[PDB]
Write a protein that binds this ligand. Structure first.
Ligand code: MG
Ligand code: MG
Ligand code: MG
Ligand code: MG
Ligand code: MG
Ligand code: MG
Ligand code: MG
Ligand code: MG
Ligand code: MG
Ligand code: MG
Ligand code: MG
Ligand code: MG
Ligand code: MG
Ligand code: MG
Ligand code: MG
Ligand code: MG
Ligand code: MG
Ligand code: MG
Ligand code: MG
Ligand code: MG
Ligand code: MG
Lengths: 145, 60, 63, 67, 80, 70, 143, 141, 206, 55
RNA sequence: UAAUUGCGAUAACGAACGAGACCUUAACCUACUAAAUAGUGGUGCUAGCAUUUGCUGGUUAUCCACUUCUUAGAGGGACUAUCGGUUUCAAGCCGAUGGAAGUUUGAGGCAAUAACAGGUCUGUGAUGCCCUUAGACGUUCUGGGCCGCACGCGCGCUACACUGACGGAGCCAGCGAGUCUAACCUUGGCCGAGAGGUCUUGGUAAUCUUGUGAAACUCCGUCGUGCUGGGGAUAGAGCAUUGUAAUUAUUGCUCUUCAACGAGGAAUUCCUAGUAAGCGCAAGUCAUCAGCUUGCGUUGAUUACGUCCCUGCCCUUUGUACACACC
């Protein structure tokens, strides 16, 4: 592409969304160590934030980073589909969400309980430490818990 | 060539032998230009058990 | 190191219980007029050239 | 292994036994001879035959052959 | 009217497999001895100009254990 | 993570003075001189080719190859 | 001497036509571009991001030049690659019917391809023209 | 009509039909020049006939090939055979014999079966294994 | 070389070398000679080829395997370890690359270097597992030229593939590397070691 | 019912996991008789008159 | 010798079943009969690029001609031929040349006498005897179950990456299969990110789907050895398809979640050439579901061309008090 230069400008590692991100990695995949943001999601957001994907997580003007966080926690406003989203049609307020970071942990809990709390067989099945999507439990998964 | 591939066994025991029956279908067509007479003569006769004869007409 | 070249002059057969081993009489090139039988490890035909790593010593049977 | 069965060699015998004048060191014509002179049911078996009666022939030329 | 049936006696039954099976069947069913039934069927087949003919009878007669029998005369190739 | 993902001005200077005597240069070869990961490695190959030093005697993907200028 | 596009190798042509379709600015590029995946048998969107429509179009162009007529179903199938069904054996899968049909319409509104009788899309008489042109351009750089 | 012949080459299921008319020396496959072909690594495999017997030979003739079936290598090995079979078909009827036999000589000397098609062909698999020779897997007990 | 052109034209260096010499990718088959007695008759070179790809019936007869061009024998044995089974096309290019590499370093016909590394890793003798009574000793044996080549092609490629495993350097580089070191054996190479250590234990039981 | 199932302790993996495995699992084919295949158990036997009538 | 296949020795001579022959499939026919349901050249009608003629396409009949390619009939061909080594100069084997083909030409189909308490009464309106027969072991209807999970065994699938993953771009098979008293195979046009939907359409098929533009693979980029962009288990939330019915999640799509696995102990399977391995397809099943099978073509090796060491089985010889024959 081009031999670049820079000075002291870029700092290695940088923390956003309550997690930590390694600098010297191509910024797209850098963002992925945040919980709830796969390569696709990552890809689109920066495509939206107007960032040179060719860059690392290293450069990225402080401003640029902010906008990246911004779009990530409001996907429906910055024109990102909805079928792109980890949690459309909630089950309470019905809004479409994309849940991020330490929050995706919270929400797996919340659903799991919502089932258990209702005595739904799927839940019962969770509470028993089993496989729930109806796979055979005879031969597979023996190491486990 | 119609293939049919089945286990010889009525049941399950034995090395899994497989067996393929086949029925061979031969199809020919001959185009003629004739009047009505010869055609009806040439179709009624020429009858043969085993050969399926079929006469259509027209250019469409 | 004294290299020693010998040309296979006859194929005698397979010793070795396994049988990967072929009995062969060779004629060493540098001054002929003498012969010695060797045991081979690879596939061999007539007029091949074997590098006897020590010229004078031969075997017979194999188990 | 290409060892010729008895029906091959038995025919070869009988043929040489009674048609030595006619037949030659040439299979190609010994082939064609077999048609006119022998009844066989398959091309394969016939060349199989004449091929050997031609071989037999070819070394009767240099000494007898028992049988 | 679009379907027509005709009977037709058959040029010597002695060279029909099926003809003689049904004969045997009727022989053993009519309370005939066994070797009688077989050798009879074979000897009529042969007599009817056959090159060779073979009759197996399997199953069980009178004793409780199954047995089988080959009945053959003349010539048969078996292969190809 | 173990260094060779950026440019550190002295590094650029390394690349210019350190690529003679390399009868062989390529993506790998650049990584082997205790520097540049494969990404910026290819960039260098294009940009030493900007003018001088390396002659392109082999083509493509995976395998690159150059020699000292003459 | 005279020229076709058949006298030009696969990649050189398209990458020149891609640079052409880009250069021009007359195109029509749906709008879901960048945010879309090309096929359900894929993992990541195109890395050309701003582009690759020009890639496909020029590819779509060249293919429909090379022959009588083709449709969306065919281009879907063409452009399709393998889809790792995770831990299950690969199966060939058809690609997006939308990317193509819109690449078709775009190239058609720009008149490089028309509807065709029999079915599908045909290389436009104006396409032949403007295809053989840039093809000739490509051997002009090789002169 | 002008002087011409048609020939072919076959590797596996690929069949490479060729037309060797008299012309100003073109060499195109399906519709593109022979300097394309690609595979490419193998490109020289199909230049090969031209080279073995001198580039000149092709100036009084035109050359076309169209390969159906086969595969991304089967087709390269087919087309070359047809090309050289073709060239030696032409000297058969139009140039003199001795010319031809000199061509066949420097082909079959070098060769990769340029005149003669390869006998090889897939074997049927049999029940009991995913291949023709390969059996499945047993364990005894 | 007397240039000539017709309709669809044939590139310069292509027109060039071809009709003249019948050489490799673009390497010299002339010169290139086997620096060890024997091993000739079991290492080709002439008849000369353009690239190492051939539909060659080299199997149906015991020894005709020998008549296969040694460069394409080398490539052939590149294509394996299940995932790369078949894939001659893949390999062929790796060798093209390889030879180019080898050439760069210390010059020489890189095809001749291949010739050298081969002749230099074939064990002049080895050992088998003769019975002798349960606790089997090791009978020394002088190994065939063919097996001496076979083992070389196998030995060479392998320890280059193992080298090339799990690291940045390409198959082409390691192959070239393994060769160069083995052309005049420098005992820094996987193969020379295995050769010498085979002849070490061959000697150690005679 | 379903209220019982989740409420029931002594259920779910954690429990089974912490139990020893019977040895009847790792058993053999059991086989039981085969060395007695040819020796008829019927006690009965045929006889040479009956087989001679029938056959 | 693959073969009780032959040569030869010979109180045996000469024959039959089985092996071989035979049949089928894949290989060769510019020889033969042909073809708008296969295709080639010429001619028109016509587009583009060049223009000096040219180059590259369009046009189920605008006409002429042909059968190399495709198809399938009839024939032909190979018999291990020529020659030379080798051998009881016997049957044979081996090498070179030639050849479409020279390993039983490659692969199958068929396959004697005899044996087993092998498997199958759960394929049969084949069947003996036993059992049961109205609160049924008949039958149908509703719902669950065959999937149930501390764990042992077997066949597989995907992987541990740099001969690679990913992203564009090149772009190439063969065996198949398809709807009448019906809803099968589906081109094309639109709508949809996707799965899909919708409007039409060709085909009872060498005629249409389909050149099945299949996957490995090829090319130019991105990543750069980091459990990494290798790997994709587990799991959440949404959208669709089949079906009367999908919860214990039929299948399909999207986002997210991102495990074990760093080539695997003792052991053990399969294999000799278009084979192994890699790669995908069609067919069976099938309303819907292939990580299975039966076939198919694609890319295409390394190593034997030997032996009796292991294991398995044949053959003599020899022991037998066995003959229901060492259960
Ligand atoms: Mg994430
Ligand atoms: Mg399971
Ligand atoms: Mg017989
Ligand atoms: Mg037979
Ligand atoms: Mg693709
Ligand atoms: Mg594709
Ligand atoms: Mg794979
Ligand atoms: Mg023909
Ligand atoms: Mg030959
Ligand atoms: Mg039993
Ligand atoms: Mg039954
Ligand atoms: Mg079950
Ligand atoms: Mg099994
Ligand atoms: Mg790829
Ligand atoms: Mg929508
Ligand atoms: Mg209709
Ligand atoms: Mg990871
Ligand atoms: Mg992945
Ligand atoms: Mg299916
Ligand atoms: Mg099944
Ligand atoms: Mg006795």
């Amino acid at each position: 592409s081009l031999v670049v230069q820079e000075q002291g400008s870029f700092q290695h590692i940088l923390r956003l969304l309550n997690t930590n991100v390694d600098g010297n990695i191509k910024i797209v995949y850098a963002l992925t160590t945040i919980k709830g943001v796969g390569r696709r999601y990552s890809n689109l957001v920066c495509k939206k934030a107007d960032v040179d994907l060719h860059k690392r997580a290293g450069e990225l003007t402080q401003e640029e980073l902010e906008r990246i966080v911004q779009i990530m926690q409001n996907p429906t406003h910055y024109k990102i589909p909805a079928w792109f989203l980890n949690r459309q049609n909630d089950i309470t307020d019905g809004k479409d969400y994309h849940t991020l970071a330490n929050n995706v942990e919270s929400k797996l809990r919340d659903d799991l309980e919502r089932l258990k709390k209702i005595r739904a067989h799927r839940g019962i099945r969770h509470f028993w430490g089993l496989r729930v999507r109806g796979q055979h439990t005879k031969t597979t998964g023996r190491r486990r818990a | 060539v119609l293939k049919i591939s089945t286990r010889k066994t009525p049941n399950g025991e034995g090395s899994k032998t497989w067996e393929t029956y086949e029925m061979r279908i031969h199809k020919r067509y001959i185009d003629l230009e004739a009047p009505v007479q010869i055609v009806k003569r040439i179709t009624q006769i020429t009858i043969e058990p085993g050969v399926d004869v079929e006469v259509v007409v027209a250019s469409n | 190191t004294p290299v020693t070249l010998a040309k296979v002059i006859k194929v005698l057969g397979r010793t070795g219980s396994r049988g990967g081993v072929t009995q062969v009489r060779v004629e060493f090139l540098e001054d002929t007029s003498r012969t010695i039988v060797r045991n081979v490890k690879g596939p061999v035909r007539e007029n091949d050239i074997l590098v006897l790593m020590e010229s004078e010593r031969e075997a017979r049977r194999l188990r | 292994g290409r060892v010729r069965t008895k029906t091959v060699k038995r025919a070869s015998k009988a043929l040489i036994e009674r048609y030595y004048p006619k037949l030659t060191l040439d299979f190609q014509t010994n082939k064609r001879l077999c048609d006119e002179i022998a009844t066989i049911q398959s091309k394969r078996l016939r060349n199989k035959i004449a091929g050997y009666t031609t071989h037999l022939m070819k070394r009767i030329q240099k000494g007898p052959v028992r049988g | 009217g679009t379907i027509v049936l005709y009977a037709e006696r058959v040029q010597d039954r002695g060279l029909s497999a099926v003809a003689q099976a049904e004969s045997m069947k009727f022989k053993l069913l009519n309370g005939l001895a066994i070797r009688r039934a077989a050798y009879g069927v074979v000897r009529y087949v042969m007599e009817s100009g056959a090159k060779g003919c073979e009759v197996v009878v399997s199953g069980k007669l009178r004793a409780a254990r199954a047995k089988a029998m080959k009945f053959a005369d003349g010539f048969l190739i078996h292969s190809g | 993570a173990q260094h060779a993902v950026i440019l550190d001005q002295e590094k650029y200077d390394r690349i210019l003075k350190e690529v003679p005597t390399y009868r062989y240069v390529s993506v790998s070869v650049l990584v082997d001189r205790l520097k540049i990961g494969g990404s910026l490695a290819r960039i260098a190959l294009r940009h030493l080719e900007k003018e001088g030093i390396i002659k392109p005697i082999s083509k493509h993907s995976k395998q690159a190859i150059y020699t000292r200028a003459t | 001497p005279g020229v076709s596009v058949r006298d030009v190798a696969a990649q050189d042509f398209i990458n020149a036509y891609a640079s052409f379709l880009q250069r021009q600015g007359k195109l029509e590029v749906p709008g879901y571009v960048d945010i879309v995946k090309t096929s359900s048998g894929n993992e990541m969107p195109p890395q050309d991001a701003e582009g690759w429509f020009y890639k496909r179009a020029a590819s779509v162009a060249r293919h429909i030049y090379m022959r009588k007529q083709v449709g969306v179903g065919k281009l879907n199938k063409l452009y399709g690659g393998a889809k790792s069904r995770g831990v299950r054996p690969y199966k060939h899968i058809d690609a997006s019917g939308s990317i193509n049909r819109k690449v078709l319409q775009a190239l058609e509104k720009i008149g490089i391809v028309e509807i065709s009788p029999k079915g599908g899309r045909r290389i436009s008489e104006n396409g032949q023209r403007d295809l053989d042109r840039i093809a000739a351009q490509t051997l002009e750089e090789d002169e | 009509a002008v002087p011409s012949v048609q020939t072919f080459g076959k590797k596996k299921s690929a069949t490479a039909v060729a037309h060797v008319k008299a012309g100003k020396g073109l060499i195109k496959v399906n519709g593109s020049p022979i300097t394309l072909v690609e595979p490419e690594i193998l490109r020289f495999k199909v230049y090969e006939p031209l080279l073995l017997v001198g580039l000149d030979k092709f100036s009084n003739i035109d050359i076309r090939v169209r390969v159906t079936g086969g595969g991304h290598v089967s087709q390269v090995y087919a087309i070359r055979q047809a090309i050289a079979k073709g060239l030696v078909a032409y000297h058969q009827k139009y140039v003199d014999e001795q010319s031809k036999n000199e061509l066949k000589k420097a082909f079959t000397s070098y060769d990769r079966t340029l005149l003669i098609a390869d006998s090889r062909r897939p074997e049927p698999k049999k029940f009991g294994g995913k291949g023709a020779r390969s059996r499945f897997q047993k364990s005894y007990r | 070389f007397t240039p000539v052109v017709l309709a669809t034209p044939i590139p310069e260096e292509v027109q060039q070398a071809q009709t003249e010499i019948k050489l490799f990718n673009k390497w010299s088959f002339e010169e290139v000679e086997v620096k060890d007695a024997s091993l000739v008759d079991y290492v080709q070179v002439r008849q000369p080829i353009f690239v190492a790809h051939t539909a060659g019936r080299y199997a149906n007869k015991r020894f005709r395997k020998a008549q296969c061009p040694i460069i394409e024998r080398l490539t052939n044995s590149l294509m394996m370890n299940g995932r790369n089974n078949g894939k001659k096309l893949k390999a062929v290019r790796i060798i093209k690359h390889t030879l180019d590499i080898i050439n760069v370093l210390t010059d020489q016909n890189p095809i001749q270097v291949v010739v050298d590394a081969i002749t230099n890793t074939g064990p002049r003798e080895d050992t088998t597992r003769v019975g002798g009574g349960g606790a089997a000793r090791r009978q020394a044996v002088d190994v065939s030229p063919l097996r001496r080549v076979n083992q070389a092609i196998a030995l060479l490629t392998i320890g280059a593939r193992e080298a090339a495993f799990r690291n940045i350097k390409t198959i082409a580089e390691t192959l070239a590397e393994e060769l160069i070191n083995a052309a005049k054996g420098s005992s820094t190479s996987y193969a020379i070691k295995k050769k010498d250590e085979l002849e070490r234990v061959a000697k150690s039981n005679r | 019912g379903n209220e019982g199932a989740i409420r029931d302790k002594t259920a779910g993996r954690r429990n089974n996991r912490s139990k020893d495995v019977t040895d009847s699992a790792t058993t053999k084919k059991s086989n039981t008789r085969r060395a007695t295949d040819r020796h008829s158990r019927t006690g009965k036997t045929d006889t040479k008159k009956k087989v001679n009538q029938g056959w």
